[PDB]
Design a protein around this motif. Structure first.
Motif, PDB file in Angstrom:
ATOM      1  N   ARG A 167     -10.643   3.653 -16.313  1.00  0.00           N
ATOM      2  CA  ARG A 167      -9.410   4.429 -16.271  1.00  0.00           C
ATOM      3  C   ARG A 167      -8.779   4.344 -14.879  1.00  0.00           C
ATOM      4  NH1 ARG A 167      -7.886   9.256 -18.961  1.00  0.00           N
ATOM      5  NH2 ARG A 167      -6.015  10.129 -17.967  1.00  0.00           N
ATOM      6  N   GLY A 168      -7.453   4.217 -14.840  1.00  0.00           N
ATOM      7  CA  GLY A 168      -6.728   4.088 -13.587  1.00  0.00           C
ATOM      8  C   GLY A 168      -6.908   5.291 -12.687  1.00  0.00           C
ATOM      9  N   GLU A 169      -7.109   5.033 -11.397  1.00  0.00           N
ATOM     10  CA  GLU A 169      -7.282   6.103 -10.419  1.00  0.00           C
ATOM     11  C   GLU A 169      -6.043   6.990 -10.348  1.00  0.00           C
ATOM     12  OE1 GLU A 169      -8.754   4.723  -6.697  1.00  0.00           O
ATOM     13  OE2 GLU A 169      -8.244   6.569  -5.608  1.00  0.00           O
ATOM     14  N   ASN A 170      -4.869   6.376 -10.472  1.00  0.00           N
ATOM     15  CA  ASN A 170      -3.618   7.123 -10.502  1.00  0.00           C
ATOM     16  C   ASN A 170      -3.554   8.045 -11.713  1.00  0.00           C
ATOM     17  OD1 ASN A 170      -2.405   6.204  -8.100  1.00  0.00           O
ATOM     18  ND2 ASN A 170      -1.583   4.365  -9.107  1.00  0.00           N
ATOM     19  N   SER A 171      -3.917   7.509 -12.875  1.00  0.00           N
ATOM     20  CA  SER A 171      -3.942   8.284 -14.109  1.00  0.00           C
ATOM     21  C   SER A 171      -5.009   9.374 -14.049  1.00  0.00           C
ATOM     22  CB  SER A 171      -4.213   7.368 -15.305  1.00  0.00           C
ATOM     23  OG  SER A 171      -3.331   6.259 -15.312  1.00  0.00           O
ATOM     24  N   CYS A 172      -6.090   9.109 -13.314  1.00  0.00           N
ATOM     25  CA  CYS A 172      -7.144  10.100 -13.130  1.00  0.00           C
ATOM     26  C   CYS A 172      -6.665  11.208 -12.211  1.00  0.00           C
ATOM     27  CB  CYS A 172      -8.402   9.466 -12.535  1.00  0.00           C
ATOM     28  SG  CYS A 172      -9.262   8.324 -13.628  1.00  0.00           S
ATOM     29  N   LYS A 173      -6.047  10.820 -11.099  1.00  0.00           N
ATOM     30  CA  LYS A 173      -5.560  11.784 -10.115  1.00  0.00           C
ATOM     31  C   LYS A 173      -4.338  12.527 -10.658  1.00  0.00           C
ATOM     32  N   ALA A 174      -3.558  11.851 -11.504  1.00  0.00           N
ATOM     33  CA  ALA A 174      -2.383  12.452 -12.141  1.00  0.00           C
ATOM     34  C   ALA A 174      -2.825  13.653 -12.958  1.00  0.00           C
ATOM     35  CB  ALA A 174      -1.670  11.437 -13.039  1.00  0.00           C
ATOM     36  N   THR A 175      -3.789  13.419 -13.846  1.00  0.00           N
ATOM     37  CA  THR A 175      -4.498  14.498 -14.526  1.00  0.00           C
ATOM     38  C   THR A 175      -5.389  15.214 -13.506  1.00  0.00           C
ATOM     39  OG1 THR A 175      -6.197  12.902 -15.235  1.00  0.00           O
ATOM     40  CG2 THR A 175      -4.445  13.405 -16.797  1.00  0.00           C
ATOM     41  N   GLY A 176      -6.139  16.218 -13.939  1.00  0.00           N
ATOM     42  CA  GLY A 176      -6.898  17.019 -12.991  1.00  0.00           C
ATOM     43  C   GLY A 176      -8.249  16.427 -12.624  1.00  0.00           C
ATOM     44  N   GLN A 177      -8.478  15.173 -13.015  1.00  0.00           N
ATOM     45  CA  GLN A 177      -9.817  14.583 -12.959  1.00  0.00           C
ATOM     46  C   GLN A 177     -10.149  13.993 -11.590  1.00  0.00           C
ATOM     47  OE1 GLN A 177      -9.277  12.389 -17.094  1.00  0.00           O
ATOM     48  NE2 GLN A 177     -11.377  13.172 -16.901  1.00  0.00           N
ATOM     49  N   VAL A 178     -10.529  14.883 -10.678  1.00  0.00           N
ATOM     50  CA  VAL A 178     -10.798  14.542  -9.289  1.00  0.00           C
ATOM     51  C   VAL A 178     -12.015  15.330  -8.820  1.00  0.00           C
ATOM     52  CG1 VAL A 178      -9.886  14.730  -6.924  1.00  0.00           C
ATOM     53  CG2 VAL A 178      -8.397  13.972  -8.782  1.00  0.00           C
ATOM     54  N   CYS A 179     -12.687  14.839  -7.783  1.00  0.00           N
ATOM     55  CA  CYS A 179     -13.850  15.531  -7.243  1.00  0.00           C
ATOM     56  C   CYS A 179     -13.503  16.957  -6.860  1.00  0.00           C
ATOM     57  CB  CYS A 179     -14.415  14.794  -6.028  1.00  0.00           C
ATOM     58  SG  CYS A 179     -15.130  13.167  -6.405  1.00  0.00           S
ATOM     59  N   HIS A 180     -14.484  17.840  -7.011  1.00  0.00           N
ATOM     60  CA  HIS A 180     -14.336  19.249  -6.669  1.00  0.00           C
ATOM     61  C   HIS A 180     -14.079  19.384  -5.172  1.00  0.00           C
ATOM     62  CE1 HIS A 180     -15.481  23.576  -6.496  1.00  0.00           C
ATOM     63  NE2 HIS A 180     -15.108  23.560  -7.763  1.00  0.00           N
ATOM     64  N   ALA A 181     -13.329  20.410  -4.785  1.00  0.00           N
ATOM     65  CA  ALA A 181     -12.931  20.582  -3.390  1.00  0.00           C
ATOM     66  C   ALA A 181     -14.121  20.885  -2.476  1.00  0.00           C
ATOM     67  CB  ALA A 181     -11.879  21.675  -3.276  1.00  0.00           C
ATOM     68  N   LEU A 182     -15.269  21.187  -3.068  1.00  0.00           N
ATOM     69  CA  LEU A 182     -16.480  21.440  -2.299  1.00  0.00           C
ATOM     70  C   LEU A 182     -17.262  20.154  -2.058  1.00  0.00           C
ATOM     71  CD1 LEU A 182     -17.854  24.723  -3.910  1.00  0.00           C
ATOM     72  CD2 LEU A 182     -16.733  24.477  -1.672  1.00  0.00           C
ATOM     73  N   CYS A 183     -16.868  19.081  -2.740  1.00  0.00           N
ATOM     74  CA  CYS A 183     -17.556  17.808  -2.588  1.00  0.00           C
ATOM     75  C   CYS A 183     -17.222  17.197  -1.241  1.00  0.00           C
ATOM     76  CB  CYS A 183     -17.170  16.828  -3.698  1.00  0.00           C
ATOM     77  SG  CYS A 183     -17.745  17.226  -5.369  1.00  0.00           S
ATOM     78  N   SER A 184     -18.202  16.517  -0.661  1.00  0.00           N
ATOM     79  CA  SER A 184     -17.981  15.764   0.557  1.00  0.00           C
ATOM     80  C   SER A 184     -17.238  14.470   0.213  1.00  0.00           C
ATOM     81  CB  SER A 184     -19.315  15.453   1.235  1.00  0.00           C
ATOM     82  OG  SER A 184     -19.846  14.222   0.781  1.00  0.00           O
TER      83      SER A 184
END
Ligand SMILES: *[C@@H]1O[C@H](CO)[C@@H](O[C@@H]2O[C@H](CO)[C@@H](O[C@@H]3O[C@H](CO)[C@@H](O)[C@H](O[C@H]4O[C@H](CO)[C@@H](O)[C@H](O)[C@@H]4O)[C@@H]3O)[C@H](O)[C@H]2NC(C)=O)[C@H](O)[C@H]1NC(C)=O
Ligand SMILES: *[C@@H]1O[C@H](CO)[C@@H](O)[C@H](O)[C@H]1NC(C)=O
Ligand SMILES: *[C@@H]1O[C@H](CO)[C@@H](O)[C@H](O)[C@H]1NC(C)=O
Lengths: 197, 124
Positions: free
Chosen positions: A164-181
């Motif tokens: 899946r495209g990183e843009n399409s992933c980031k477009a949706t909410g599918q990103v590492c949790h803000a607590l992740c390094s």
């Protein structure tokens, strides 16, 4: 009291001539923590195979693998039930040693699945062999991982494409949790962080 | 327990013919339905042709109906794909595949073993 149980991998001993984990053989993986060998999970497992009198694998029984922490060989997953978003059956897998490698190259191979995250929250070491993760049309998060923290030998490389495209992933909410390094994540929850900030 | 190797590819002129072969090795003495796929740059891997273990059932994608013919020689452990009246739109990497069982399938998701691939280029 910590217990460890070693079991043969697909292709070895009790599973000498098996192609994949299947309905007939999967019960024999119960309480296993360390696989001495490889694990293949193929499309055959799911449609059944009359030629070997092997009925189709009930997807719920994959959860037997939840006790596996170690694999001396490689992990090959080329088929997986659609209604599973991740590989939580391997949510406790810590180590893939890769003494044996698929095609002599890959220690971890995740191919042509419909998952949206790997979900290997416990994976801390891929001692040898390369990692291929391709053709998973819905898979996000895979690009965030810092594979160098997991490798052990010299020339270990990744081949992560056609997901899946990183843009399409980031477009949706599918990103590492803000607590992740910055070391990435296996999914969107803090448990899926490689390391916590 | 089956390794596949594609051969017979390379450059071809439009209107020409070309025969691809897939050689299988390893535990070959059981049922495998065999398929041919192709992946053009940018595009996703599509189904071309499929053949059953016995060789009596075969399938072709609409884009190659009439032009392509699949066959197998279980004695030689091979699967041939005769491609005629080739067009530039056939340019792609051709992959050979095996699915444990008797039947062939028109999706890549049912095949358990894959070849490395062979490039087939079609020019004016
Ligand atoms: C799913 O998992 C099950 C359980 O692991 C697995 O079942 C096993 O299949 C193998 C392969 O068919 C069986 O082993 C065979 O048994 C028959 C009958 O005794 C023998 O004829 C075979 O011997 C051959 O072996 C030689 C060397 O390999 C050959 O050269 C020779 O021609 C012989 O014919 C072979 O030993 C085994 O009995 C079962 N086990 C059980 C518990 O059922 C099944 O294959 C798996 N299926 C898939 C699709 O992965
Ligand atoms: C697994 O461990 C359980 C105890 O949790 C035990 O009852 C069972 O006999 C063991 N073996 C299998 C195959 O489940
Ligand atoms: C995975 O998704 C594809 C669509 O791209 C579908 O054809 C396939 O059936 C899905 N997987 C399974 C096991 O059904």
């Amino acid at each position: 009291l910590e217990e460890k149980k070693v079991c043969n991998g697909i292709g070895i001993g009790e599973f000498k001539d098996s192609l994949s984990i299947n309905a007939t053989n999967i019960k024999h993986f119960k309480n296993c923590t360390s696989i001495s060998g490889d694990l293949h999970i193929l499309p055959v497992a799911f449609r059944g195979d009359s030629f070997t009198h092997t009925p189709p694998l009930d997807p719920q029984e994959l959860d037997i693998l939840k006790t596996v922490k170690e694999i001396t060989g490689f992990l090959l997953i080329q088929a997986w039930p659609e209604n599973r978003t991740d590989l939580h059956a391997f949510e406790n897998l810590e180590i893939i040693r890769g003494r044996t490698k698929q095609h002599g190259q890959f220690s971890l191979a995740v191919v042509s699945l419909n998952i949206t995250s790997l979900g290997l929250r416990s994976l801390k070491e891929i001692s040898d062999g390369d990692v291929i993760i391709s053709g998973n049309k819905n898979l996000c998060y895979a690009n965030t991982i810092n594979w160098k923290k997991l490798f052990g030998t010299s020339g270990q490389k990744t081949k992560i494409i056609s997901n899946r495209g990183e843009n399409s992933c980031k477009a949706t909410g599918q990103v590492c949790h803000a607590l992740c390094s910055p070391e990435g994540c296996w999914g969107p929850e803090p448990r899926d962080c490689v390391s916590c900030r | 327990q089956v390794k596949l190797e594609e051969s017979g590819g390379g450059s071809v002129q439009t209107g020409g013919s070309l025969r691809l072969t897939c050689a299988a090795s390893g535990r070959t003495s059981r049922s495998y339905g065999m398929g041919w796929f192709r992946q053009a740059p940018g595009k996703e891997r599509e189904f071309v042709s499929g053949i059953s273990w016995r060789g009596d059932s075969t399938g072709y994608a609409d884009s190659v109906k009439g032009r392509f013919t699949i066959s197998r020689d279980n004695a030689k452990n091979t699967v041939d794909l005769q491609m005629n009246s080739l067009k530039p739109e056939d340019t792609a990497i051709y992959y050979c595949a095996a699915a444990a069982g008797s039947a062939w399938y028109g999706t890549l998701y049912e095949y358990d073993y894959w070849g490395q691939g062979t490039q087939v280029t079609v020019s004016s």
